[PDB]
Amino acid sequence: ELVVISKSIVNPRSLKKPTSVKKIQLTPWDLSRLRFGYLQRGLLFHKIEVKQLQASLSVALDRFYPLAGRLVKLKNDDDTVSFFISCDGSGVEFVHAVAKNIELSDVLELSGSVPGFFASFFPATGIKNYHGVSRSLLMVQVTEMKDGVFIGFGYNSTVADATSIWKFINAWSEICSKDSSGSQTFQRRLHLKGWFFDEIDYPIHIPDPETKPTSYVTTPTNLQEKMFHVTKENVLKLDAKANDEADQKISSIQAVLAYIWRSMVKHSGMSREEETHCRLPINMRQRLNPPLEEECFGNVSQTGIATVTVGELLDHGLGWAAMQINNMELSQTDEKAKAFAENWVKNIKIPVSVGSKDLVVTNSHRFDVYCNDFGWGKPIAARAGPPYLNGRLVVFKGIGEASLDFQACLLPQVVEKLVKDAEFNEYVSIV
Amino acid sequence: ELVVISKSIVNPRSLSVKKIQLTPWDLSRLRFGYLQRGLLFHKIEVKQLQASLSVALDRFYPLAGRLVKLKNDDDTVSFFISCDGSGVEFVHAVAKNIELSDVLELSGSVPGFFASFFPATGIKNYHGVSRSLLMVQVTEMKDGVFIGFGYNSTVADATSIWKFINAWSEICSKFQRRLHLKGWFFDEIDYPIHIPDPETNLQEKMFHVTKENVLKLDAKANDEADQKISSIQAVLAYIWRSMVKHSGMSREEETHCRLPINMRQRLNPPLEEECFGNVSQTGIATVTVGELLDHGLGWAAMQINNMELSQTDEKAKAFAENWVKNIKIPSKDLVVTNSHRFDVYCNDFGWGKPIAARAGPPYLNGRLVVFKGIGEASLDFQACLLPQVVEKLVKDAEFNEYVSIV
Numbered sequence: 118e119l120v121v122i123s124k125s126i127v128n129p130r131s132l133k134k135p136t137s138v139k140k141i142q143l144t145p146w147d148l149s150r151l152r153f154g155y156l157q158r159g160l161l162f163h164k165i166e167v168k169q170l171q172a173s174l175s176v177a178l179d180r181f182y183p184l185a186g187r188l189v190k191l192k193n194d195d196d197t198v199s200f201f202i203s204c205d206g207s208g209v210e211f212v213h214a215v216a217k218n219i220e221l222s223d224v225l226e227l228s229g230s231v232p233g234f235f236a237s238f239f240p241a242t243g244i245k246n247y248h249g250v251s252r253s254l255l256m257v258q259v260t261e262m263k264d265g266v267f268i269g270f271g272y273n274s275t276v277a278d279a280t281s282i283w284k285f286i287n288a289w290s291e292i293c294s295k296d297s298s299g300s301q302t303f304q305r306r307l308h309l310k311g312w313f314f315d316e317i318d319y320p321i322h323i324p325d326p327e328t329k330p331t332s333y334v335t336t337p338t339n340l341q342e343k344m345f346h347v348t349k350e351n352v353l354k355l356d357a358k359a360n361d362e363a364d365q366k367i368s369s370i371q372a373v374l375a376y377i378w379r380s381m382v383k384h385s386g387m388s389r390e391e392e393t394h395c396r397l398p399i400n401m402r403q404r405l406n407p408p409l410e411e412e413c414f415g416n417v418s419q420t421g422i423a424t425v426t427v428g429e430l431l432d433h434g435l436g437w438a439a440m441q442i443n444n445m446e447l448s449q450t451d452e453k454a455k456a457f458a459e460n461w462v463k464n465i466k467i468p469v470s471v472g473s474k475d476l477v478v479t480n481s482h483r484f485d486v487y488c489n490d491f492g493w494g495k496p497i498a499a500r501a502g503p504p505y506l507n508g509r510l511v512v513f514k515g516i517g518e519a520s521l522d523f524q525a526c527l528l529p530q531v532v533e534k535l536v537k538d539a540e541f542n543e544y545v546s547i548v
Numbered sequence: 549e550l551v552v553i554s555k556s557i558v559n560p561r562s563l564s565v566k567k568i569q570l571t572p573w574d575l576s577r578l579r580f581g582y583l584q585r586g587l588l589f590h591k592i593e594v595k596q597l598q599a600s601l602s603v604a605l606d607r608f609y610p611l612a613g614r615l616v617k618l619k620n621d622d623d624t625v626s627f628f629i630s631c632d633g634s635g636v637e638f639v640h641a642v643a644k645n646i647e648l649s650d651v652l653e654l655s656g657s658v659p660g661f662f663a664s665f666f667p668a669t670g671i672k673n674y675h676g677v678s679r680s681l682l683m684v685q686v687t688e689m690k691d692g693v694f695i696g697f698g699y700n701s702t703v704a705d706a707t708s709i710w711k712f713i714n715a716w717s718e719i720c721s722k723f724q725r726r727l728h729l730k731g732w733f734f735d736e737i738d739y740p741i742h743i744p745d746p747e748t749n750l751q752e753k754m755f756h757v758t759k760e761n762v763l764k765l766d767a768k769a770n771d772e773a774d775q776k777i778s779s780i781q782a783v784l785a786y787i788w789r790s791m792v793k794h795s796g797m798s799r800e801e802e803t804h805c806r807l808p809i810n811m812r813q814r815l816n817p818p819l820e821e822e823c824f825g826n827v828s829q830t831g832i833a834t835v836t837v838g839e840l841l842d843h844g845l846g847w848a849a850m851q852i853n854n855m856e857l858s859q860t861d862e863k864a865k866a867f868a869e870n871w872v873k874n875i876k877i878p879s880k881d882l883v884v885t886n887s888h889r890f891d892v893y894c895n896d897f898g899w900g901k902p903i904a905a906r907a908g909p910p911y912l913n914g915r916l917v918v919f920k921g922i923g924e925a926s927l928d929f930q931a932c933l934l935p936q937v938v939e940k941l942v943k944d945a946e947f948n949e950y951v952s953i954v
């Protein structure tokens with residue numbers, strides 16, 4: 118129940134005399150994601166005016182110009198290909214849609230089988246990162262609802278990590294809020310991530326990612342999504358309990374993730390001998406040597422993986438699970454990252470999926486998603502879009518900074534057991 | 549914990565004195581405390597809030613008045629509201645360690661820190677001779693702002709106070725008709741009315757009911773009931789049955805659901821929807837515990853609806869006229885307050901709609917403050933409960949399916 122009003126390309130609006138076309142080189146981290154789908158997130162508002170939003174977007178794209186570029190695929194004479202990002206100002210796909218029968222309650226209170234109507238609010242479903250040669254690296258959809266507006270976006274993981282994407286959304290909202298021409302918002306020089314793998318030749322020669330199985334997103338699933346809210350009081354309670362049991366210092370988010378992990382596995386139906394993983398995004402800017410600037414733009418995120426058996430996770434307590442997470446984070450070193458990049462170049466792996474039997478943590482509690490006031494008020498919710506993956510756990514800072522929200526994608530049988538888990542529902546509010 | 553930055557008397561912006569006479573409904577509430585409610589925001593600029601309040605008091609000028617107490621020669625007293633522009637008490641305070649999470653998620657013993665966000669705790673309606681009839685406190689938090697207010701029930705009902713808040717925020721964000729007062733609608737009662745001189749371990753939880761679960765309860769109640777039942781009647785009945793189930797009361801006890809009734813359209817002649825003043829009464833549905841527990845949701849909902857249908861003009865008149873010859877100026881009930889009809893979120897003062905609405909002290913067992921949800925189809929309730937009832941409610945699987953308790 119969604120009609121498209123307009124589909125257009127939004128180009129950067131360049132007050133400056135345009136410079137040459139910058140080329141951005143792709144690392145093993147970027148190339149190993151070429152077959153994954155665009156990541157899709159969005160913000161819910163009481164009010165957004167689309168004209169101002171589109172105008173301010175063109176200005177913001179000038180300031181974050183790699184988001185307006187395209188992948189370029191080179192054919193090597195050895196029958197491999199190479200990719201780089203060309204900052205050519207090709208522009209961003211921008212969709213204006215209307216879903217006049219959908220109201221805020223419907224998106225705030227989402228609960229149950231996915232995909233549902235909400236999937237259609239996102240613009241990049243089924244788009245893979247290697248499609249960025251011909252589709253934009255950022256895609257935006259603004260959907261007017263009965264009594265609100267949703268701004269959804271999808272982005273190519275080869276051009277940006279979530280840290281960078283949320284910095285762009287914050288700049289865009291600031292411009293939109295103050296004046297759409299950008300004349301009243303400070304322009305800042307963009308620092309690029311650059312090339313930080315000094316022992317790896319580039320561009321890296323890889324097999325063509327499109328000459329690969331190419332697997333569907335519209336296939337029927339049995340997945341559901343639920344929202345989990347953890348209050349400040351309960352975050353603190355979990356934090357204290359994890360630290361009481363643990364032998365090293367455990368952060369609040371580690372304790373809460375460990376609690377969710379244990380609970381998710383308790384109700385999974387997995388055998389004790391199965392391995393379960395907690396996959397966590399790690400911002401590597403400050404772990405690399407030399408470290409990169411905290412504001413450098415691009416994907417500088419690595420996925421850390423904590424591995425245990427189901428039996429181990431259930432037999433030990435909360436503090437032990439939190440220690441597995443923390444130990445994994447501590448292991449994500451510079452020497453590790455570089456050695457592994459050099460191994461990747463001699464055993465290229467570009468998977469189509471992550472796997473469905475893990476806790477797959479994404480986004481971050483650190484991103485101030487509510488600071489995105491476009492001029493009519495801060496958002497009232499932050500959500501993720503397709504694709505749907507069992508075990509996905511999207512982390513959002515709460516409207517209350519001390520609280521946490523999680524958007525969890527789970528099998529129906531797991532939800533059914535989770536909603537009857539008395540202790541879980543003491544610590545976590547499921548909607 | 550709470551630091552006061554400033555206190556001001558805000559009069560109407562514009563520079564005989566109109567008298568508003570008090571009805572038996574007003575006079576009966578003289579010993580009650582001021583009612584206190586408020587709105588939570590990301591951002592409020594205090595200077596603009598205060599200037600706009602002066603402008604708003606031009607329109608809602610009774611809120612800037614004072615009670616006047618007359619001593620009559622027959623050893624009684626009389627009260628009226630003198631619209632003298634004395635002004636509204638306006639307090640600016642800072643709670644630097646309190647954050648949005650704390651107010652959104654209040655849960656547990658009351659009174660707690662939040663009580664201090666409200667300006668009129670311990671103030672009774674008869675104190676309006678010397679204290680303002682509306683009191684405002686704007687409390688800056690670590691990462692947000694709360695606008696708390698208390699009001700004297702002799703000058704306004706909740707319908708009127710929320711219309712005032714709506715007008716104030718509209719003025720601050722920047723009226724085709726002038727303010728019309730409710731007037732004297734008891735033609736068989738003389739004024740001023742002569743009266744005698746009028747002078748617990750509780751917890752609060754937030755309940756949210758989703759659009760989906762409101763509709764489920766509505767459908768259930770209507771399937772069971774023989775008259776049409778509204779969504780709010782169905783949800784209130786469900787909460788009522790659940791509270792009584794976990795109350796510890798025996799079958800023979802009488803228990804009540806108390807509900808605010810806007811009487812404007814029930815009076816004859818009916819009064820204008822926007823007429824200003826207190827034109828509300830409390831309706832009381834009475835049942836025994838055993839009956840409420842034995843019968844289903846639709847029957848409880850019918851008890852509420854039947855009570856509402858009985859709130860007639862003729863009854864109100866007869867009761868008021870006898871009240872003047874039997875002045876009465878004064879639990880484990882369901883005490884419903886506020887209403888789903890009030891649009892909480894239209895109160896944008898210029899920096900964004902509110903992110904929550906809340907009630908303040910006083911705290912009383914069984915209070916259930918109704919707020920329309922951010923999601924317009926949904927409902928929020930601020931419930932004041934005994935710890936033993938809470939413990940039973942959190943272990944009630946069905947209740948926690950229909951209602952999200954935080």
Ligand SMILES: O=C(O)CC[C@H](NC(=O)COc1cccc(C(=O)O)c1)C(=O)O
Nearest residue numbers: 153156274398420471477479480503504
């Ligand atoms: O950015 C991240 O959270 C991981 C990025 C990347 N993974 C994918 O790009 C596809 O798998 C996922 C994993 C998590 C969330 C989603 C989603 O669509 O939200 C998809 C990786 O694992 O290195």
Ligand SMILES: O=C(O)CC[C@H](NC(=O)COc1cccc(C(=O)O)c1)C(=O)O
Nearest residue numbers: 580583701808829830884885886909910
């Ligand atoms: O407006 C209403 O809900 C009732 C008004 C009045 N009642 C009192 O003035 C004192 O009893 C209450 C009842 C409900 C809430 C509170 C509170 O403090 O929120 C106090 C009455 O019965 O006509």
